[model samples]
Target: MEKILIFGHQNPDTDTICSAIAYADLKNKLGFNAEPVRLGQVNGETQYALDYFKQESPRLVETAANEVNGVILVDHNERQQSIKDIEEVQVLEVIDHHRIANFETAEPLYYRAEPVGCTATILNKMYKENNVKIEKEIAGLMLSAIISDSLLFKSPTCTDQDVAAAKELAEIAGVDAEEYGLNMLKAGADLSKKTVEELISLDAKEFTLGSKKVEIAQVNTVDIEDVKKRQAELEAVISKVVAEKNLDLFLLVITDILENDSLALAIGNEAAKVEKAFNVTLENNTALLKGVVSRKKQVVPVLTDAMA
Candidate 1:
């Protein structure tokens, strides 16, 4: 078989990156020619894991059709969250954990999507089912992904499978989960140097909710106020992005990962949908969402319902 590409969403997160790498390994081991590629640059959190595990970042690509005839999507199923020329190529398989929208296929294919906090959680089971031993470095990467997606098992999106998979991966990787998780989480918490554009795009996805083009972006930090300090700049860029993309609603979720809380900075004319979605009034276009961390779990569906 020709080389088939594998990747995650546009603004790829830790789970996205690690799942691509991990799944690529699994597919290769199962007698397929597969390669893991990324749609965006690696963020600090993912970079930290790669460095610790001595793994290289997946090569970035804008269009997979130019290189291969098929691509496997991980961590995201929405077309808008995928590569630019996704419609021009064949979607060989899709492994994701997000709500399935704007997704379709012309033929039968391998599609695996679970409600687990991290796609790596599903990938972990696949490794065992196939009777393949998890590599130490891959285990570490998978562990990093689970910690990140679950915010160290605090996010509401996290499931029992995630917690179980995380600890097992930690054992395989030979690390203390809590100790290493905190340090790894802190490594990506530095928001002082990020430009407003980079900050919003770090971990974001677009969704079409009830005839509205809605976008939600998230960033994690130990101190919520630290990222909030740049709210003015962030809103400015967010508003500009809304206009540029003609988005109906844009939400920037600044989450205190440790505290397991979030502050949503909303923009666009349809911003009222946010207040309706979360049942919190926006003060200065920002609202304190107590105990809201996972956008996939706490944000998208509610907002989708509100718009619907």
Candidate 2:
């Protein structure tokens, strides 16, 4: 009897959070001892969605460096993996929709890491295939994640399958895609009453290169420049938080709404990796990772590869 820890990349988004929960449900239905966890705090949009649908957001799992049993890596698959603390478990299954990178595994164990727009889309398929009953709350969560990550099927990472799945799941979740999409976007962008530290750790995910460690925090909004303008504040807060957590490196990615670009602010060890990967000189401490917005697709793999 093996226990499975199902989790997503650090700084979880709608896709990461929802997919972990839904996938865990699927594994449990199949009689596996599976549990879902997040890498950071559930942010405003995700919190609202979970609360609205009466779903419990998964507990945060800080590091995947130690072994409990099986590990299910969602939203990402790489050595810059989120489950850095879980050093001793077999990577039983990995379901993601990001660029495939170097994940330390000899044999595949239920791996279904596609380049699709949302990991939630993959989870939806698993539930349907297994004929598992999806509660409205879970359905809504999965649907929201799909829409947000794919931008309602507008992102290049999105495929026809993603669109169809989203539509079907949205109906089951009792949500009007257009309305719910806008609501989620607005809620995510509302940065009121959130300290920079809170924002950084809200969805923080981590990676390590050699002896250097890094964590990436995702913040989605329409005004990325506004977020970038607060770099000094974010850096100070991130430095303090990383020191408190004993992290060596940290990256903050603020994705602009309706744009194919993101403002990346990095701190701690090898902060220049972002600039090196993007092939650009960063102003102050941040750079615009051009055509890099989706956390599932762009941010995770790039950082994973950049790690030494």
Candidate 3:
């Protein structure tokens, strides 16, 4: 049997990385030769979870080669977020929580998507429905993924199902959800070591709204002021990126995890749309977005509507 490759989006967050691993394990248990891979370097929080659970990081691969028998996607379905040669590969399955956009497969396959907070919540249901026993390490990974994506159940995208699944997974993983989630989140909050380029790429996504090309990037921090100290440096990088990519708008959101707020640095031609979307005036190209921590639920939709 040929080995089937599985991975998530390009800029792999905790949910993207963990869901790929969990779903691959589920596939293998059901008698498939599935293997987990990662598209980018694991971030601090994801590394902390792996170390805590004593799990190895997935092997990194840049693109889906045609030689691969099949591929499974998780956390994202957009072509811009996928592997370089994804169009050439056979898409065996897709499990994501984001909006279904710019996606098509040559043949029908298992596609599981929901409006829940995290992809792990959906994968947790798949495990239960298929009678697959989740091991301790896998449970810990799933729990971490949920906490990361939902911002510890604080994100507006979080649903009741996500909370319930996290509680149960925490029990199986033998860790308190609140304590572990806080520790994991804090681990990624340190940005002193990262350069401006690294900061922007940490959790960035690109989108095309009609004729407008936009890039939305976010970095989680415990102290919003700490990140603001380097705002000028970040804006310079954002400006360069926008010019090179010809982006109509580039939004770099500095999210304060503890306060559930964000400070967005808006740049490029359509930058004022952030003000219109959030009802906040931009001073020095930055706007204080109160209660706007979720890029999926809070930022993207509003901006899309404003640009429309």
Candidate 4:
């Protein structure tokens, strides 16, 4: 069997990482020669989950075309957020939940996505449908994906299936979903060790929305001001990254996970688009957005519409 590589988006978050691993596990059991790989280094929450479950992190790979002929995407479908040579490889499958845009394949393939919060929730269904047993560590990582994306089941993106899948996977994983999830979230939110560059790229992605090149990054914290403490420096770094990547808009949403509110740190000339997207004037390129936490649900869609 020809080897196939499976991976998620560039800034591989918990859902992205776990989905790749769990789906590869499922694929291997189905008699496919699949290997889970990652585009970027694991973030703190993802590293914490891998340690908690005693699972090794996936091998990091830069371009899939050099190593494998086929690829299976997890957690993301957009080309810009994926591998650099995504156009060179054959997309064998796509398992994602985000709104699909700017993705096309030459050949017909298995494309499965739903509105569920985590890709692992969808992968859990795939495991059951394929009648394959989920390994304990893989199941825990899958549970971690559900907990991470759902924000302990508080995110608006979360659905009943995500919760039920969390319960099932947690039972299989033998960990209390709420407790482990809170600890993992807190671990990721601990920003004491992060530099400004690390803060911006912690969980970031690039998107071409209509006509603008946009980069939206997020970090969770207990207190929003902790990240705002470096607001001046954050702006400095964001400006540098925008120019380096030629991004028109860069929004770093420092989300207060406990309160479900966000502080949007806007940069670049398209700052007015943020104002138009959220209907809040930016005071010195920053504004407080109430009840806006999910970047997938609230931020991306809102900003994409504003560009339209």
**What's the alpha carbon RMSD for model 4?**
0.9
lDDT (tens digit, per residue) of candidate 4 on 1-308: 99999999998899999999999999899998999999987889898999999999999999988898899999999999999999999999999999898799988999999998989999999999999999889999999999899899999999999999999999999999989999999999999999988899979988888989999999999999888889888988999999999988999998888998999999987889899999999998889999998988999988989878
In model 3, state the lDDT of residue 216. 91
lDDT for every model? 0.90, 0.76, 0.90, 0.92
The residue pairs that clash in candidate 1, if any, are none
**Model 3 per-residue lDDT at 160:** 97
After TM-score superposition, the amount by which residue 162's alpha carbon in candidate 3 deviates from its true location, in angstroms, is 0.5
lDDT of 3 by residue, 147-170 (tens): 998899999999999999999999
TM-score of each: 0.98, 0.79, 0.97, 0.98
TM-score of 4: 0.98
Error of 3 at 109 (Å): 1.9
* Count of backbone clashes, every candidate in sequence: 0, 19, 0, 0
lDDT of 3 at 78: 87
TM-score of 1: 0.98
